[PDB]
Design a protein around this nucleic acid. Sequence first.
DNA 1: ATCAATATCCACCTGCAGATTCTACCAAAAGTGTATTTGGAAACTGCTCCATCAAAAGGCATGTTCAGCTGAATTCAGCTGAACATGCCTTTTGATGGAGCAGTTTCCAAATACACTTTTGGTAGAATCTGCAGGTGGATATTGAT
DNA 2: ATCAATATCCACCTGCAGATTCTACCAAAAGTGTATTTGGAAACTGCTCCATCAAAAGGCATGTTCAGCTGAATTCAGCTGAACATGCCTTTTGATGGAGCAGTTTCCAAATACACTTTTGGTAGAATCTGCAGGTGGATATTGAT
Lengths: 84, 78, 97, 99, 104, 108, 92, 94
Amino acid sequence: RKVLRDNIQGITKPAIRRLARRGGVKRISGLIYEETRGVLKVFLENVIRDAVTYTEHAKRKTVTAMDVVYALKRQGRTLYGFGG
Amino acid sequence: NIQGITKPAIRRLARRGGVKRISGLIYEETRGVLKVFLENVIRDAVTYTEHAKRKTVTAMDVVYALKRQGRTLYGFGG
Amino acid sequence: PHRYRPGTVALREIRRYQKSTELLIRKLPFQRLVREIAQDFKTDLRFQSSAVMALQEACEAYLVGLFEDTNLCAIHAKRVTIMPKDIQLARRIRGER
Amino acid sequence: KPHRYRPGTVALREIRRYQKSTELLIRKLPFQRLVREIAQDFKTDLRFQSSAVMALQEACEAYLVGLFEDTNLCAIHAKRVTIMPKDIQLARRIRGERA
Amino acid sequence: KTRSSRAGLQFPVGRVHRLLRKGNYSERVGAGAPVYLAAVLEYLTAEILELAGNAARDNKKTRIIPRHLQLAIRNDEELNKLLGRVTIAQGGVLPNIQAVLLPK
Amino acid sequence: RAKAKTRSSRAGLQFPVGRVHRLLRKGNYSERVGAGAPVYLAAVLEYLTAEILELAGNAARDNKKTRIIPRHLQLAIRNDEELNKLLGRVTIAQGGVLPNIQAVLLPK
Amino acid sequence: RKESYSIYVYKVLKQVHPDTGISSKAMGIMNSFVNDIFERIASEASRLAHYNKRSTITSREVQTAVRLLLPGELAKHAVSEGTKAVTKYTSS
Amino acid sequence: RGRKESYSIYVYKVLKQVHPDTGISSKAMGIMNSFVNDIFERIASEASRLAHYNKRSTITSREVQTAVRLLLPGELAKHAVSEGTKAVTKYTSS
DNA sequence: ATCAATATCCACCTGCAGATTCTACCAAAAGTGTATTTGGAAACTGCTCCATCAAAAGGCATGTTCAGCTGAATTCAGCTGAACATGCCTTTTGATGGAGCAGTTTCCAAATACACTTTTGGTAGAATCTGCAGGTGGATATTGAT
DNA sequence: ATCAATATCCACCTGCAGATTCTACCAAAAGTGTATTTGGAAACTGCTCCATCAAAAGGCATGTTCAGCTGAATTCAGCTGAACATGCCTTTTGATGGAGCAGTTTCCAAATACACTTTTGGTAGAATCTGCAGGTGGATATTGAT
């Protein structure tokens, strides 16, 4: 049982660079990286907040793919491929 | 009839949207955008009218059409 | 002969119409527009007048909001003048395009 | 030579490369740690089906890619080529994420 | 003597129950569900009316009108988000001029 | 006792009309379900399936593959105006994006 | 007869602002608001019961749905009010 | 056991009709199952709302048709209406 | 900003009329009582798959150096859009007819519901089939010259 | 200015993880028989929406002048991309303990059903009160000139 902290810094500068590339960006200001980590943490917090609300309502201790899919759909971000 | 949406009406809308200066090309462009919007909203509204087998578009038909377009409107029945 | 400088009457108009809530498109030309577009689906449909009014509130709130976004796009380009290209960016990012 | 590409050439190459492919671009184990850290701050001692972590990662990467496209258009609009915080903020404000 | 009075509420528990029962939501409706839903609706309504009456007294009205509802909604972060996709007719917009548009 | 015909074969469908009917009936959509509602619905769902699978198969052929993958489904959805509109708020897992570089970024 | 929440909105208004009134258009707004939030809560609670193979919507589904739909402190106060009203209703 | 229903076999059948020499990966089949479930719920819930708006207790093919017209973007709608109508009449001719 | 002149904004009234409340009636809805049935919680447990740990490799993050070229700042003018006067006309306001459209009201064939019985279509898992990942390393295209 | 260096393209090849086929059990469609629900055909209204029409209120179209904004051009500091070495830590493959997901069973607290019985909210005239018209003119703000 070990303590999870600061894992937003696992979203590295190079990985962020790749995502921007896929999004078409040719040149990236130095401040973008912390900005992107902030936006991602907020997005993922919102999604996981709702997925855990579905998990708790079902009296489970295991977040399922379906809980995540329901949270994404509630928020206007429908995801295909994870209904099995 | 689209031209009845006049340059000063369009200015009034831009002013309420906080716009201070306006290019001459905006009016035509605005009239295009308005037109597309209306064609969408009325289309579906008519469809509700037709499913009910009426020929009077009601306020509620418009409310439903706006709603299924993610544009909920209050004050007319929901 | 007295003249306001460019922009001063424009700021005055922003204050006025942001303080107000009245409809800014005239009723009859917009009702005419609505009936033309609608006739392009089934001619001689009746409209409850509250339905025309609902359409107008929706339309003006949509154009006003769109102008607020367009305005932010113009200012982002170090401009104070909205241009068709600003409308276009706003709508592309909104997912309308 | 010693051979050196001009700034921009290798980034254009990388745009073509990553727009052709579909692999996740964020390392898997760090992203999983991130997901468990966030979720544990909301209910201690959840487990995750690994399916649920991959669904979160697909959603997150597609969101960031989409936002970066919109950010790019905002930078182009101000006649720049370099994306900056104010471009992300303009994009998210117009999306209604935080208007 | 009604369920509404029994639960401490102005909003109609009986009506809310009938509306769940007939809305194609589930086969069965538990007895606490409409009490709870009516309470939530009353609470949100009170929040809105609290703020809108405040906004109507700061413009020194005594009658709440749609404009006061829009001012109440948009100046309040949580309500503005909850109603982020809602058009209030005759509500107008907040007074808001971008700083770069001002003189001097 | 009469020979059994599936409702799908009767309607000339590949999609399962009877399953669609039960799912309608247990979905809390309405108190009752008309006989023709699951046939129409199953028909529309099969048609949309054929359309997507047609375009994605063409995209797999173009990429010199015989197995459809999510990337082929993405290519087909996003290169088709109506499918892209209909699925405008959907993420295709492992889908990627369409190749697109803004003109102003290319070398001058 | 067409029904609405007008009298109930009016009574809540006399709770929070006894001297303030409300115009007819404003009451139409409030009515649309109540209808809106009702359908959001109910339909989310319906989905919640479906996902979990239950035929019944209980206050448990309403509460979870409130937790998914309202943003933060509104959710917390709404959960408090629903729990309070249910406890005060069961007591009789 | 744990029996899990799915649209996979019907998706596969349609695949063989449109491309008889083409396969499909299980992730792509998961996309197609997701798609079917999604379009299903949009149509069924719009039809539910349509019956409810007009005070009817039954969802019929008419509600399905008008739901399809509200949900599908144009030529998709037209062809979907044709296939649904065709299948219904073919069905009712027993 | 100092200042006087000019134009529009706006707190301030006061009545009156148009809304917002009193008076009052009544079906439809809500509550209450009783009789029932039943969905889901509790308990109990098999066995899927989740958490964790490790090794071994080698992919990719990190940290550095440096200069190409980008963003930022500045200057300037061509020309576009704001302000305005003017005089024309479209829309507002409002009244009038009357048609035809919603919108209830029964009556009842036609449709859907639902239990029981029989008959497959659909799933799981095992067994078989086979693209293509992923390793090749030439073939061609693009780049950036010294 | 062809040339060197580099990257990408594209074709090759084969085992194996993954996909397709098959097979047998069984859940759930389908048939059958009957009970229940319903939504249209005919009928009767009576709001309510359109088609007129006109007088005068505002609001719009047009043409001119010029303030000042947008866009081009130019300069330069210094950020960010490209290229390198190093070595961490992710990926992969794998084995293992066991949490808890899920599949089943019993059986009541909590649900539906049905018959009455009161109550309430909707409704709509009539009787009694804020809010717009719209007077202002008196501040408040802007402007060209110093």
